[PDB]
Ligand binder design. Structure first.
Ligand SMILES: NCCCNCCCCCC(=O)NO
Ligand SMILES: NCCCNCCCCCC(=O)NO
Ligand SMILES: [K+]
Ligand SMILES: [K+]
Ligand SMILES: [K+]
Ligand SMILES: [K+]
Ligand SMILES: [Mg+2]
Ligand SMILES: [Mg+2]
Ligand SMILES: [Mg+2]
Ligand SMILES: [Zn+2]
Ligand SMILES: [Zn+2]
Lengths: 345, 345
């Protein structure tokens, strides 16, 4: 083994109490016990050294995200409370079809402008946890750049749904995209980001969509049926310089590893012909057969197989944690990917 | 003078229990007591004959709204319930900036595709109430077309935020736009729609935006500060043939009638030069100094002056009821407009 994990205790600063779901406010799926359970499994399995993140500042964040958005995330909660709202910060209105993509002054307008959904409440400490999660990913990228074959960025909150200036799907900063852009800024000519979380990495796709230096691939449930609904379809192959440098691979309900791994192989062949200098894996274990909000049927053992197949790509590899919501198995599942990468069958 | 009022007892079929507001689910502002209080004031003041709407079917609604959107509103609640959701039907995800305006299959995706906000819950009876409210406006239009100088369509739910295929702002069918298009379909060459509700009539603006046969004017609170946030700015003057046939007049918080009436005069001047054959007034009394969600400062007496000034345009006039959420005064305020129109000071 010996794969290092980066973990920040500041993730628990994000501990919201409400999530809009089926017309009700429920206890959030993206809860701090997710990160604590994975961390406990990392320790129990003696995967490798565990370290806290270094502070990289907002520079590397703003290589991917707009300055207006970064500013909004820092002040959103304070403005929400100042305006007198009594719940957590949830968007109520947005730029509907036929409306202008124009940034307004009021906090409700800004919330809607910068969001793609209302299940991602903001409260005190969300900014701090998001900042820490991006630094977790950047610390993992640094470890790999300086000689580690791979590293595990135990990110929370997750990142892959966040656009340059849009938050949602429990994500604020796109940790995987930030790590990929760090590779590029450090002179890695080509980077691939492979998204194995159950949901489409729409944020990552959007950020590099017109670019051929960063190849983006996502396997995910059919957006006709599940979040994010309005991106992730297989006809989205990129634009401009980036045409043919994005690949979406879609699956229907009940898809098992025997079928999902065929898409994995197609994604692997695409990476191989792209021949990147570094690989970022946006790893969600919500592909699990017990995941409460997803519809694939991977077993815990399949994650060993996934990790083994990823190692065979022979690339410097940064894993960023995304989704996965069966907390009983989340640690067994996530660490299985790392152990399969390191040689366990 | 006397004015007839069209009222549907079917408005009570819309009776939702939740509204997303400031991160909480609260009792809805747009409540049945609004319509019942106005009707009781219409009776107590003996304004004129009260009658129920005629059923015109969806034909006239579909002159304004798309077939797909009208189908969605009919089935939305049933699909939501069949999908297992336990609350009222509230959008959770939508077409964020950078995503595709593409209709998906899942009801959550459809809900988001067809909405601009999350404060407008759908439940059993919403479809029937929306239909009845459109018929209320169409009956008033018929009364005027057949000889009445003016008629009061006591619509609930309101309409002016609804686009051809977007609902929100408590609106589903754009009653004012449906009445305007009915005038046009019956051979009235030119129609003006004047929106004195506190909020921008973005739906009416969008529906006629590229047309010169239907002049749309709205006075409203600055959308930089209040809903609908992403339309309503004074630089939106129309497009194509519709250029110069849309007019937005914006005011900041605390604006009193002494200032607001100056914008009203500007709108009346624009109407006079347009010289329409019929007038539809989308009437909200949320401009009232005690409205709980708005920031203008009209008094109850100012509505008599409003009614009088609108009569002086000398046009066949349909009033469609929009917003206004201080139930204590909503009856006095709205009927004051009708009474001022009939010569009461
Ligand atoms: N209360 C809304 C229902 C659940 N939310 C939808 C998907 C959010 C994204 C989660 C994820 O794991 N993305 O990778
Ligand atoms: N819970 C949302 C806060 C208050 N609602 C927003 C404005 C809806 C438009 C109402 C209206 O009267 N438009 O004319
Ligand atoms: K994915
Ligand atoms: K790309
Ligand atoms: K208005
Ligand atoms: K127009
Ligand atoms: Mg506001
Ligand atoms: Mg759904
Ligand atoms: Mg009062
Ligand atoms: Zn996921
Ligand atoms: Zn209003």
């Amino acid at each position: 083994g010996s794969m290092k994990t980066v973990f920040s205790p500041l993730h628990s600063r994000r501990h919201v109490k409400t999530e809009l779901d089926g017309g009700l406010l429920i206890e959030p799926h993206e809860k701090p016990s997710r990160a604590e359970t994975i961390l406990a499994r990392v320790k129990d399995q003696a995967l490798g050294e565990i370290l806290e993140p270094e502070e990289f500042g907002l520079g590397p964040v703003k290589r991917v995200h707009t300055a207006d958005y970064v500013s909004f995330l820092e002040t959103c909660w304070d403005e929400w409370v100042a305006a007198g709202k009594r719940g957590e910060a949830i968007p109520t209105f947005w730029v509907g079809r036929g409306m202008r993509a124009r940034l307004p002054k009021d906090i409700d307008g800004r919330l809607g402008y910068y969001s793609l959904g209302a299940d991602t409440s903001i409260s005190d400490g969300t900014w701090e946890a998001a900042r820490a999660s991006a630094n977790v990913a950047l610390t993992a990228q640094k470890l790999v750049a300086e000689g580690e074959r791979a590293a595990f960025a135990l990110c929370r909150p997750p990142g892959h749904h966040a656009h340059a200036d849009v938050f949602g799907g429990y994500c604020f900063f796109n940790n995987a995209a930030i790590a990929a852009q760090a590779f590029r800024d450090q002179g890695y000519g080509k980077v691939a980001v492979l998204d194995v979380d159950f949901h489409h990495g729409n944020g990552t796709q959007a950020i590099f969509y017109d670019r051929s230096d960063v190849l983006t691939i996502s396997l995910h449930g059919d957006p006709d049926l599940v979040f994010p609904h309005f991106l992730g379809f297989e006809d989205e192959t990129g634009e401009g310089d980036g045409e043919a440098y994005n690949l979406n691979i879609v699956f229907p309900p009940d898809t098992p590893f025997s079928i999902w791994s065929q898409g994995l192989e197609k994604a692997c062949e695409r990476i191989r012909t792209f021949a990147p200098d570094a690989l970022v894996v946006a790893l969600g274990v919500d592909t699990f057969e017990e995941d409460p909000i997803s519809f694939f049927k991977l077993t815990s053992g399949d994650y060993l197989k996934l990790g083994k197949r990823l190692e065979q790509l022979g690339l410097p590899t940064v894993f960023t944690m995304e989704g996965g919501y069966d907390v009983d198995a989340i640690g067994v599942n996530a660490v299985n990917v790392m152990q399969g990468f390191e040689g366990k069958s």
